[PDB]
């Protein structure tokens, strides 16, 4: 009754009222590639009421890059300026909007604060354009540009390069913490996603995801 | 993010763009109760209609598991009022609109696991004589309001025939098309005037000889 008409992404959805983690339900059940699944809240991501939290199944033949343009693309749609911070939130004007989740079958989660109550410092879709949002509209609309996306990245995986860069904070000074830390401008990512920093000194050095947290100066 | 306010029914719900049959999903696959599965359109049904089947494993005597079918009938009857449309049963399992048929429920089950099936014709096209919602009010109906109300009435239906399992009879009787002339078709096909239905929910049939007759389960109206 959805009426969905994208070709992978959404294929099957899968709606609870409530759920532990998206994410879980996904990695751990028998499910085909392009099942969404959406619940109005995860206990144990607690997400609450209001937010859009799905996880998407797939099984391609950069991943968390095509979450965060497609939230990116989303929110351009509704007329908010959502920029990434590398490589899987989303915020506008320095506050988080969304977060995105890869585990791996590969499964994509998403959550999105769209008119939840959020933590200090986050903010959401209600809260930036004054009012309620229509979660269903913000559903259709992300998921008509994550299944336009996932479609282009199976044929030229290199494409979302461009566009994360594009929608990315760069050209500001980043502290990387892993096991030990240093600072630099994020100049730029590269052609494996890595996230090109520029030290003081001049030493460039190239971070990959994984065991280290990005925080901004 | 339907957000969804039910108690059992729709506590989980699991679309396909298309499916063969979302009764035959229902069947086979393990679901917890309330689990609602709704599709565009069934293969073995076309896009616009609101093609869905609900899993229910009911506590109850015996018995009561023949009024499933009943619940779905009326659950269909009070979402068409809300439209402003007037639906009436045709025992056992269609929703009549001036006679013609914009509703089916069909009840199969697989261990102690009950499915309820329900097509209703909203904005997809459909054979001549039958009718939809779009056709009844004139314009496009959003079916996700439909799914919406339908679903809020089966829950409340529902739990009460957890508690209450006769009270569905009446509301089949006073929603449903009686006092009229029908022909049960088949092996000892006979004719006569549908009265009621007992509290079995059988229809009870009076021949024009005088004699009763009860039916558990082809009907034509005269």
């Given at each position: 009754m959805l009426g969905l008409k994208t070709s992978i992404i959404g294929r099957r959805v899968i709606y609870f009222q409530e759920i532990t983690s998206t994410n879980e339900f996904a990695k751990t059940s028998y499910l085909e590639e392009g099942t969404v699944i959406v619940a109005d809240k995860q206990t144990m991501g607690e997400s609450p009421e209001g937010g859009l939290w799905l996880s998407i199944v797939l099984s391609p033949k950069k991943i968390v890059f095509?979450?965060?343009?497609?939230?990116?693309?989303?929110?351009?749609?509704?007329?908010?300026?959502?920029?990434?911070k590398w490589p899987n939130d989303v915020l506008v004007n320095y506050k988080k909007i969304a977060g995105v989740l890869v585990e791996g079958k590969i499964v994509l989660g998403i959550g999105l604060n769209v008119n939840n109550k959020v933590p200090n410092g986050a903010t959401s879709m209600k809260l930036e354009l004054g009012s309620e949002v229509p979660l269903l509209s913000v559903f259709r609309s992300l998921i008509t540009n994550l299944?336009?996306?996932?479609?282009?990245?199976?044929?030229?995986?290199?494409?979302?390069?461009?566009?994360?860069?594009?929608?990315?904070?760069?050209?500001?000074?980043?502290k990387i913490l892993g096991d030990g830390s240093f600072e630099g401008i994020a100049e730029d990512i590269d052609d494996f996603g890595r996230l090109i920093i520029r030290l003081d000194s001049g030493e460039v050095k190239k971070v990959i995801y994984g065991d280290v947290s990005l925080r901004f100066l």
């Open positions: 095509l979450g965060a343009v497609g939230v990116v693309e989303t929110l351009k749609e509704f007329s908010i300026d959502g920029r990434i299944d336009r996306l996932y479609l282009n990245f199976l044929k030229n995986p290199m494409d979302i390069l461009n566009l994360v860069r594009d929608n990315m904070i760069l050209g500001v000074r980043v």
